[PDB]
Motif scaffolding. Structure first.
Motif, PDB file in Angstrom:
ATOM      1  N   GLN A   8      30.731  45.606  37.607  1.00 39.32           N
ATOM      2  CA  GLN A   8      31.444  45.899  36.337  1.00 39.32           C
ATOM      3  C   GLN A   8      32.290  44.682  35.923  1.00 39.32           C
ATOM      4  O   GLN A   8      32.663  43.857  36.772  1.00 39.32           O
TER       5      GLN A   8
ATOM      6  N   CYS B  79      42.713  44.454  41.784  1.00 41.07           N
ATOM      7  CA  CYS B  79      42.543  45.824  41.216  1.00 41.07           C
ATOM      8  C   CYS B  79      43.034  46.882  42.200  1.00 41.07           C
ATOM      9  O   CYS B  79      42.804  46.768  43.405  1.00 41.07           O
TER      10      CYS B  79
ATOM     11  N   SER C  77      41.033  49.542  38.641  1.00 41.27           N
ATOM     12  CA  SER C  77      41.913  49.218  37.472  1.00 41.27           C
ATOM     13  C   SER C  77      42.795  48.002  37.765  1.00 41.27           C
ATOM     14  O   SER C  77      43.520  47.946  38.769  1.00 41.27           O
TER      15      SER C  77
ATOM     16  N   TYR D  74      34.286  52.263  46.843  1.00 42.65           N
ATOM     17  CA  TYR D  74      35.513  51.934  46.043  1.00 42.65           C
ATOM     18  C   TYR D  74      35.281  52.361  44.583  1.00 42.65           C
ATOM     19  O   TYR D  74      34.344  51.851  43.923  1.00 42.65           O
ATOM     20  N   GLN D  75      36.107  53.328  44.152  1.00 38.69           N
ATOM     21  CA  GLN D  75      36.021  53.971  42.803  1.00 38.69           C
ATOM     22  C   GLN D  75      37.287  53.754  41.964  1.00 38.69           C
ATOM     23  O   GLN D  75      38.315  53.467  42.493  1.00 38.69           O
ATOM     24  N   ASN D  76      37.114  53.926  40.645  1.00 38.94           N
ATOM     25  CA  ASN D  76      38.207  53.966  39.630  1.00 38.94           C
ATOM     26  C   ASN D  76      39.024  52.663  39.689  1.00 38.94           C
ATOM     27  O   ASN D  76      40.296  52.669  39.762  1.00 38.94           O
TER      28      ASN D  76
ATOM     29  N   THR E 212      36.853  56.094  48.917  1.00 43.10           N
ATOM     30  CA  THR E 212      36.266  57.418  49.310  1.00 43.10           C
ATOM     31  C   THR E 212      35.982  57.593  50.809  1.00 43.10           C
ATOM     32  O   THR E 212      35.875  58.757  51.287  1.00 43.10           O
TER      33      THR E 212
ATOM     34  N   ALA F 155      42.199  50.710  43.532  1.00 39.41           N
ATOM     35  CA  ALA F 155      41.011  51.562  43.640  1.00 39.41           C
ATOM     36  C   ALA F 155      41.304  52.740  44.551  1.00 39.41           C
ATOM     37  O   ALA F 155      42.271  52.722  45.331  1.00 39.41           O
TER      38      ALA F 155
ATOM     39  N   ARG G 235      44.536  55.173  48.695  1.00 39.80           N
ATOM     40  CA  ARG G 235      44.701  54.362  47.465  1.00 39.80           C
ATOM     41  C   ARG G 235      44.887  52.919  47.931  1.00 39.80           C
ATOM     42  O   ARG G 235      45.936  52.612  48.532  1.00 39.80           O
TER      43      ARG G 235
END
Ligand SMILES: Cc1cccnc1N1CCCNCC1
Ligand SMILES: [Cl-]
Ligand SMILES: [Cl-]
Ligand SMILES: [Cl-]
Ligand SMILES: [Cl-]
Ligand SMILES: [Cl-]
Ligand SMILES: [Mg+2]
Length: 348
Positions: free
Chosen positions: A7, A35, A24, A20-22, A40, A37, A45
């Motif tokens: 991304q 970032c 920002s 590793y998700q979300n 999971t 993340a 966090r």
């Protein structure tokens, strides 16, 4: 090998394992992008740092290797640890990018010393944890070199971790003028008096402890010379014994141009503080680095009596830093780094 996904986040391609998700964005710098993340696999966090231009020069390739070695070694409750390290490359030949993963930190000390009321019991617990972490770091013959409130993470339960080790990265411009980057540095490193060693970190702990007791910076100099004058007014001018240890003749001539001043009465500077806190500050803030208290000695001081447990103050495994004197090519530093990424084993 995990599956990776790609991304674009603020002008940068991120290629990371599906765990590793979300993602920002949080921070940008000359040495990397960060970032937040959600991991999971662990439920933490996490903070994820992507390195910028890690192999762009011999100096940059060696700094990449140094950071990865240091951070993989550090396994202590009061020090930054590595949760994970990875590259999307499938071989040394396509290796370009390095990503480092830690626990996501909220508040730093600044965020609790600026705006919160600290009891003597809070100061005891915060400084105890810094010294516990420094006993471990110094047992490996590592010097942090950059201890200051912004490099100390603190949670809702007053639990503390040391981060952002000095990787010999600070420029002349960064240390110039009315700047927090210099207010916690020992005078022998600020002015290049002599070969420094691990005692520089105890000076920084003294400066931090003083600021938790008063709510004010101890030596907020407007430049190197102003800051030295503030330091010598509190601790006194050097005697013949320290002057002999200063290697620069011009640095010795300059000190000798200043009018002599005695050490001040610390009970009249730190008005109303715990007498045991005053005593410990007099043992840290000693001009001659040979005479400063060590981290292991400070843990046994009576100020920490409610927290000290000599069976729960661990030392480090031995740390081989022989690479620091080694002369290698960019591709040799890059291969060494690659081996350290692929051999990583996560914590329990
Ligand atoms: C994410 C990371 C990786 C390697 C080294 N330090 C890192 N961070 C830790 C605390 C959060 N702030 C930024 C720095
Ligand atoms: Cl995954
Ligand atoms: Cl950690
Ligand atoms: Cl890569
Ligand atoms: Cl700071
Ligand atoms: Cl080692
Ligand atoms: Mg920092």
């Amino acid at each position: 090998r995990p599956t990776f996904y790609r991304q674009e986040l603020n002008k940068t391609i991120w290629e990371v394992p599906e765990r590793y998700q979300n993602l920002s964005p949080v921070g940008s710098g000359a040495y990397g992008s960060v970032c937040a993340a959600f991991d999971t696999k662990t439920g933490h966090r996490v903070a994820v740092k992507k390195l910028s231009r890690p192999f762009q020069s011999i100096i940059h390739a060696k700094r990449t290797y140094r950071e990865l070695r240091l951070l993989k070694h550090m396994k202590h409750e009061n020090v930054i640890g590595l949760l994970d390290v990875f590259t999307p490359a499938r071989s040394l030949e396509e290796f370009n990018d390095v990503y480092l993963v830690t626990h996501l930190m909220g508040a730093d000390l600044n965020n609790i010393v600026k705006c919160q009321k600290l009891t003597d019991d809070h100061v005891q617990f915060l400084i105890y944890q810094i010294l516990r972490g420094l006993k471990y770091i110094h047992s490996a013959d590592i010097i942090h070199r950059d201890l200051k409130p912004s490099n100390l993470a603190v949670n809702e339960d007053c639990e503390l971790k040391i981060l952002d080790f000095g990787l010999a990265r600070h420029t002349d411009d960064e240390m110039t003028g009315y700047v927090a980057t210099r207010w916690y540095r020992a005078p022998e490193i600020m002015l290049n008096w002599m070969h420094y060693n691990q005692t520089v970190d105890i000076w920084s702990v003294g400066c931090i402890m003083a600021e938790l007791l008063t709510g004010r910076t101890l030596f907020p100099g407007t430049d190197h010379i102003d800051q030295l004058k503030l330091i010598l007014r509190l601790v006194g001018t050097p005697g013949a014994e320290l002057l002999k240890k200063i290697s620069s003749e011009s640095a010795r001539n300059y000190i000798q141009s200043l009018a002599q001043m005695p050490k001040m009465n610390f009970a009249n500077v730190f008005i109303g503080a715990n007498p045991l806190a005053v005593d410990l500050l007099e043992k840290m803030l000693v001009l001659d680095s040979d005479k400063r208290i060590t981290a292991a000695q400070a843990l046994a001081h009576a100020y920490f009596a409610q927290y000290h447990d000599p069976d729960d103050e661990p030392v480090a495994d031995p740390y081989d830093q022989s690479f620091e004197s080694r002369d290698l090519l960019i591709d040799e530093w890059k291969s060494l780094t690659y081996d350290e990424v692929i051999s990583f084993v996560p914590p329990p």
